[PDB]
Amino acid sequence: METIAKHRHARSSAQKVRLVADLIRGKKVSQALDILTYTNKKAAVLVKKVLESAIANAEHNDGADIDDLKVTKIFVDEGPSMKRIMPRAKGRADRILKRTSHITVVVSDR
Amino acid sequence: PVYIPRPRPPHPRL
Amino acid sequence: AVQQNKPTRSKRGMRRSHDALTAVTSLSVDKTSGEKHLRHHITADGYYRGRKVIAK
Amino acid sequence: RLNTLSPAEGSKKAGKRLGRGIGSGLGKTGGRGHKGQKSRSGGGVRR
Amino acid sequence: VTGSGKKPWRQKGTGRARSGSIKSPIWRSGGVTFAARPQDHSQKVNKKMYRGALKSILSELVRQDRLIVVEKFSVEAPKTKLLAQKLKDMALEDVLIITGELDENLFLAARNLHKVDVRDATGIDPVSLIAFDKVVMTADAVKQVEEMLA
Amino acid sequence: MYAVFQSGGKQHRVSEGQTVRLEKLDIATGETVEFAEVLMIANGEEVKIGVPFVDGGVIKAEVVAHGRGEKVKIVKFRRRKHYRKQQGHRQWFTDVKITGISA
Amino acid sequence: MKTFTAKPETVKRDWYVVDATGKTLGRLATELARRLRGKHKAEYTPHVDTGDYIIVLNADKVAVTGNKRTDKVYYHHTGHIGGIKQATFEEMIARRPERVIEIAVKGMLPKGPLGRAMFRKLKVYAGNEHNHAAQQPQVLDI
Amino acid sequence: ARVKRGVIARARHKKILKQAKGYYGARSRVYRVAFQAVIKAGQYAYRDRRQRKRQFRQLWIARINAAARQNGISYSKFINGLKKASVEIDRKILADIAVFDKVAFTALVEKAKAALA
RNA sequence: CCCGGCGAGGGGAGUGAAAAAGAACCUGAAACCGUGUACGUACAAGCAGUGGGAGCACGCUUAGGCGUGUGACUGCGUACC
RNA sequence: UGUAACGGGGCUAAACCAUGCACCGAAGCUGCGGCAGCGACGCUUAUGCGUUGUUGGGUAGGGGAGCGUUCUGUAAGCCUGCGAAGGUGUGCUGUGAGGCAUGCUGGAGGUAUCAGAAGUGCGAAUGCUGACAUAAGUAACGAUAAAGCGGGUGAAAAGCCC
Ligand SMILES: [Mg+2]
Ligand SMILES: [Mg+2]
Ligand SMILES: [Mg+2]
Ligand SMILES: [Mg+2]
Ligand SMILES: [Mg+2]
Ligand SMILES: [Mg+2]
Ligand SMILES: [Mg+2]
Ligand SMILES: [Mg+2]
Ligand SMILES: [Mg+2]
Ligand SMILES: [Mg+2]
Ligand SMILES: [Mg+2]
Ligand SMILES: [Mg+2]
Ligand SMILES: [Mg+2]
Ligand SMILES: [Mg+2]
Ligand SMILES: [Mg+2]
Ligand SMILES: [Mg+2]
Ligand SMILES: [Mg+2]
Ligand SMILES: [Mg+2]
Ligand SMILES: [Mg+2]
Ligand SMILES: [Mg+2]
Ligand SMILES: [Mg+2]
Ligand SMILES: [Mg+2]
Ligand SMILES: [Mg+2]
Ligand SMILES: [Mg+2]
Ligand SMILES: [Mg+2]
Ligand SMILES: [Mg+2]
Ligand SMILES: [Mg+2]
Ligand SMILES: [Mg+2]
Ligand SMILES: [Mg+2]
Ligand SMILES: [Mg+2]
């Protein structure tokens, strides 16, 4: 079956989180967890926590057997980007975007 | 932006 | 010093075609603790090549 | 009946609307030519 | 529009377009270009034209058999029940009653019958004459209508 | 086996037992129709390339249906001259079913 | 109907040996380009290479009338700022004889993908022997 | 009576964006660009409804020349031979025959040479 | 109840007609950013389409091919105000 | 800047002169089909047409005819929780604006017909407001006073505590 796990309003850019998520796609959840464990990205921390969450949801609400699991679907959507302000030289004010993203992982019993 | 920085002077093409 | 026309999604993805990450090929397995670690790195416990050199 | 009524053919000319396309005829300078005092809002000489 | 007359920026120098009032019609929350006013949509009608149209519509009601002309038409006491019963025996649904002299009895009886309008021959008007299916007219009402249209 | 005949100011190299889509022929919905303007007969090795309008050759068709084609949007346009015009067109046709190429 | 169109999956291409001893360069080249583009076949489709593989032999013995042998200059520019290198017809035959025929026919062919694909089918050789005896190329005269 | 031109403008824009489907990038996503695309697509279609007849006739002519040259006579001479033999088969059917029925085209060339001589 | 920092967020469960009505909450458009799928694309040059057009993929009778996606190769083609 | 004064290939005829015959060649002309304007004659009407002829490039501009939106009467009528408006596709259709049917979402309004009014149609105005891309995961992370280590706390310590 397909058990979902979402981190919505993830405090980081989708450009980066998906950059890291393109690793663990279709990879069995074990080697996926390990790749993420030794991948050196804040986005890797984030997607690893979401994947743990998906595994727990699968083996508590929707069944069991971590071993028979794959990360079939994983995608990172843009989230509501916070519009801050950043004052630059000569009275000109930028707009620094405290971006975010909507990470979503789907583990499958295949 | 209520402040509007002046433009730098153009090259004097006289 | 700045573009004349805005680039496109095609050119953008084409630039990012290289910025993709590369997973660590294969983790090792310590002779003693049987656990996984980076090659030439001490395990999450402290074992390195089967020798508990931290225990902290 | 109050919905079986109609004026005579020719009574209502039905106006003329300026600046509402091309196929409407007069759009984009609405029948008043290009630049010149007569083309200006409130443009036109005294009698 | 509630505002001020300050030019929101210079005429030159800036990169922004010209602008000289925040109350311009273009701007959001600006002022309507040709802002409507309380006008008067009253039209003129030549007395002859009014009478002619009304004689013509009475002729057309007579021809289409919608003018039910009768003698005195009345209810005895103010009961909309009595009145609806009268119109139910008279085979009527949507009617304009026109009496030469109106009594508050029948007027109060027809006040609450939204498909029934009771009037007096002095206050007839073509929009009612056409909007109502059956126009019932007392004989004295017809005489007044005659002596007024003529 | 085929015959060459014109219908709408243009010709057709049609074989027996098939369908053609000619220009609109003012015939009835399903009535029969023949074409005395056969320009050429094939019939295998013996190819009878008649001179204009093969003498004895005549075709027998069968009016299948009358309809219009899918629309085609004419778009005239002139840049900078404040002029453009559009209009659709659905040419009428006529389906005929070749019954038999009577040599 | 829908008029016939060739199909490269199905078009049959044949092989033609052509000696080029003494033949006029331009006329030989025009005939080669015709047969490569496939304009000799009733199935000639403009957007399909329907030609014939053609081998050219004795390419160093093609002829040029007039004084073209020592006057028909070949110009090519390398890309560098000075790089405009020229070489007469005599010198071209001396160094790369096959390039003469290849240049002529390439110029006479179309341009673009299909023009290059039609040029490929040309097998110009300077000598008299060709190793393509495997394909049974039928002797041609153009 | 105030009018909010939301729904009608949306319809007017989608009507163009549907015809601009298949084009590249902003030309199929943006209205300010899909419009010029739809317009120049229409212009090209209107011009090609004539260029198509031109292209097809010249293709037919090329194929008829090819088959005629296989059968020993040129295209100009062969068309003249048909004109003199009073044949009326147009180039479309001529070239179709040339492709499909070779022997009937040989017979055509024979008739044409017979009328030329 | 479960993962998680006795987090944020989420998956269950529950209420509810409905929780892509969960409070960032009726409807939920377009721009823009993505995942999967079919096709194309790493020797090919330019307003990126249009006419032709093979091949591929897919759905319908019966073969007639048609309908949809793509679109190799090819002719013309220097946006709009 | 590079051949660079056939468009290229190339040609000693594929050049120039003369004669001739074919052919290609345009949205021209002809053919088939279709629409429309105007005229001319007849039945009869501002018409269907017997028809005929002819016209139909078009800016500024003038003329004519329309579609569509919101609101009023028609309408206490009509469609609608057996699913409205809107959204989103599909099919069909009209010369065009457009229209109709309907799948899915949507969950309460919509409204014939014929008349009436106009805040009645946007692609441009260095247009206004909102949202969102581009450069770009680029520049920079704000004094070149300068950090190292051990321990503690903690989900996590270069930056916190010792
Ligand atoms: Mg800003
Ligand atoms: Mg990069
Ligand atoms: Mg004027
Ligand atoms: Mg102007
Ligand atoms: Mg002027
Ligand atoms: Mg003027
Ligand atoms: Mg002042
Ligand atoms: Mg206001
Ligand atoms: Mg008065
Ligand atoms: Mg070319
Ligand atoms: Mg309103
Ligand atoms: Mg799209
Ligand atoms: Mg033509
Ligand atoms: Mg919502
Ligand atoms: Mg509600
Ligand atoms: Mg969207
Ligand atoms: Mg190459
Ligand atoms: Mg390739
Ligand atoms: Mg080019
Ligand atoms: Mg005609
Ligand atoms: Mg007349
Ligand atoms: Mg004309
Ligand atoms: Mg005109
Ligand atoms: Mg005009
Ligand atoms: Mg307006
Ligand atoms: Mg404009
Ligand atoms: Mg850079
Ligand atoms: Mg850099
Ligand atoms: Mg610093
Ligand atoms: Mg520090």
Q: From the alpha carbon of H29, which nucleotide's C1' atom is closest?
A: I31
Closest residue, chain B, to A95 (C-alpha): B1
User: Of G59, G7, G17, which Cα lies nearest the Cα of G38?
Assistant: G7
Number of domains chain H is built from: 1
Q: Is E14 an interface residue toward B (CB < 8 Å)?
A: yes
Return all residues near A25 (Cβ < 8 A) that are at least 6 apart. Answer: A71, A74
Distance CA A85, CA A44 (A): 28
Residue with tokens 């062969």: H78
Distance CA C52, CA E21 (A): 78
G123 phi/psi in degrees, rounded to 5: -130, 50
How far is residue E14 CA from its own chain's centroid?
Answer: 58
Q: How far is the CA of H84 from the centre of ligand 29 (A)?
A: 95
Q: Residue E125's domain spans which residues?
A: 1-149
Domain segments of chain A: what residues? 1-110
Return all residues near G99 (Cβ < 8 A) that are at least 6 apart. Answer: G92
G96 phi/psi in degrees, rounded to 5: -125, 85
Distance CA G82, CA G84 (A): 6
Tell me which DSSP letter residue E11 carries: S
Residues in chain E whose beta carbon is closer than 8 A to a beta carbon of chain D? Answer: 127, 130-131
Asked if A103 contacts A79 with a C-beta cutoff of 8 angstroms, the reply is no
Number of domains chain E is built from: 1
Q: Is B1 an interface residue toward A (CB < 8 Å)?
A: yes
- Report the gap between the CA of C25 and the closest CA in chain A (Å): 9
Beta-bridge partners for G122: G54
Q: Tell whether domain A1-110 is in CATH 3.90.1150.10.
A: no
- Nucleotides of chain I within 7 Å of a protein C-beta? 1-4, 7-12, 24, 29-36, 43-45, 47-55, 64, 69-77, 79-81
Biggest distance spanned by C-alpha atoms of chain B? 34
Distance CA C14, CA F35 (A): 62
Listed as own residue / partner, the contacts of H19-25 with beta carbons closer than 8 Å and 24 or more positions apart are H25/C8, H25/C9, H25/C10
E24 three-state secondary structure: coil
Q: Which two tokens stand for residue E106?
A: 């029948």
Q: Is the CB of A60 under 7 A from strand I?
A: yes
Other C-beta atoms closer than 10 Å to the C-beta of H98 total 29
Residue H5: nearest ligand to its CA?
25
What DSSP string describes E76-137?
Answer: SSS-HHHHHHHHHHTT-SSEEEEESS--HHHHHHHTT-TTEEEEEGGG--HHHHHHSSEEEE
**CATH at residue E56:** 3.40.1370.10
Q: Is the CB of G26 under 7 A from strand I?
A: no
Q: Is D42 an interface residue toward F (CB < 8 Å)?
A: no
H3: alpha, beta or left, given left = phi > 0 and alpha = psi -120 to 50?
A: beta
Q: Which of residues 71 to 110 on G have a Cβ less than 7 angstroms from any strand I atom?
A: 110
Asked if A43 contacts A16 with a C-beta cutoff of 8 angstroms, the reply is yes
D39 three-state secondary structure: helix
What DSSP string describes chain F?
Answer: --EEEESSSSEEEEPTT-EEEES-----SS-EEEES-EEEE--SSS-B--SSS-SS-EEEEEEEEEEEPPPEEEEEEETTTTEEEEEEE--EEEEEE--EEE-
Distance CA E98, CA E109 (A): 14
- Residue E144 parent element (H or E): helix E139-149
Asked if H56 contacts H62 with a C-beta cutoff of 8 angstroms, the reply is no
Residue with tokens 């790089």: G83
Distance CA H2, CA D38 (A): 31
Rg, chain A, Cα only: 17
Tell me which DSSP letter residue C52 carries: B
Distance CA B4, CA A31 (A): 56
Residues in chain C whose beta carbon is closer than 8 A to a beta carbon of chain A? Answer: 19-21, 23-24, 27, 36, 38
Tell me which DSSP letter residue C15 carries: H
CA dihedral H99, H101, H106, H112 (to 10 degrees): -80
What DSSP string describes chain H?
Answer: -----HHHHHHHHHHHHHHTTTS-THHHH-HHHHHHHHHHHHHHHHHHHHHHHHHHHHHHHHHHHHHHHHTTS-HHHHHHHHHHTT----HHHHHHHHHH-HHHHHHHHHHHHHHH-
Tell me: is residue A48 an annotated ligand-binding position: no
Q: Residue B11: what residue type?
A: H
Helices (H), chain C: 9-16
Q: Residue H50: what residue type?
A: R
How far is residue A9 CA from its own chain's centroid?
Answer: 10
Write the secondary structure of chain G as one string of H (helix), E (strand) and C (coil): CCCCCCCCCCCCCCEEEEECCCCEHHHHHHHHHHHHHCCCCCCCCCCCCCCCEEEEECHHHCECCCCCCCCCEEEEECCCCCCEEEEEHHHHHHHCHHHHHHHHHHHHCCCCHHHHHHHHCEEECCCCCCCCHHHCCEECCC
Question: Could you report how far apart the first and last alpha carbons of chain H are, in Å?
Answer: 85
Residues F85, D28: C-beta atoms closer than 8 Å:
no
Q: Residue H67's domain spans which residues?
A: 1-117
* Exposed / middle / buried, residue H100 (Cβ in 10 Å: 0-12, 13-18, 19+): middle
Q: Is the CB of A47 under 7 A from strand I?
A: no
Residues of C in contact with A20 (CB under 8 A): 21
Pairing of strands F11-14, F3-6: antiparallel
F64 phi/psi in degrees, rounded to 5: -80, -60
Domain segments of chain F: what residues? 1-103
Q: Which two tokens stand for residue F14?
A: 């049609």
User: Of A79, A81, A83, which Cα lies nearest the Cα of A102?
Assistant: A79
> What's the Cα-to-Cα distance from H50 to each of G23, H45, H46, H54, rounded to whole Å?
43, 9, 7, 6
Residues of E in contact with D41 (CB under 8 A): none
